[PDB]
């Protein structure tokens, strides 16, 4: 259930 991208 990931977040995708830069912090």
């Amino acid at each position, epitope marked *: *259930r*990931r*977040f*995708y*991208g*830069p*912090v």
Partner: antibody
Amino acid sequence: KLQQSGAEFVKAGASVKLSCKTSGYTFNNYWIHWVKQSPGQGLEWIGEIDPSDGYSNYNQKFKGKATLTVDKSSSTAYMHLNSLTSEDSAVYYCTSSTSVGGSWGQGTTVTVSS
Amino acid sequence: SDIELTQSPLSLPVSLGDQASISCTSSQSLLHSNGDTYLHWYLQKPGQSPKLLIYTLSNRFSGVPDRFSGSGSGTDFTLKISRVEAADLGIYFCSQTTHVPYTFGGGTKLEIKR
């Protein structure tokens, strides 16, 4: 448009809730992350929370130390730190990001010292 | 067995108006199965929070000029800065979000040569 709570100066063994006020648009669209900057350990990812449904993942290291919550009503993001120690003395950033970037808060300093 | 990101060098003196390049080496492959490589570069200016330059390997954050360029693959990654300006000075961090927990490199300070 991010807005982080004021500096904290706390005893060891304390708990503090740091806060981060954003827009109603931000909260709906962006994910929220918390990040730690300390002179001992540099930059560290604490964890993330999807304000849409409150779903959250954590850096294994910060499980137990940090709890992440959101309150839709006020479009505010919260990070609870508990059992505080001198190693927790740091600048803590709240961020809003997407797959194509976003922005980081100005950051709350926490100082853990008696 | 978290992903460690090693930057080199620590401090990089450059003439203003010249090229700069900064290396970030990952202890593991950051290539995600969707084909993206989630290696990002930030710049931190003194007394301010980190700002995104380049994301998912080589994409420019909105408003970042193209004189900032990200490349690499596998485990070797480069940030090239093409026409170094004064407002480019400060500390550059790499960061991976391919694997949880997300990590940050130790930072490279871009300085003025003379």
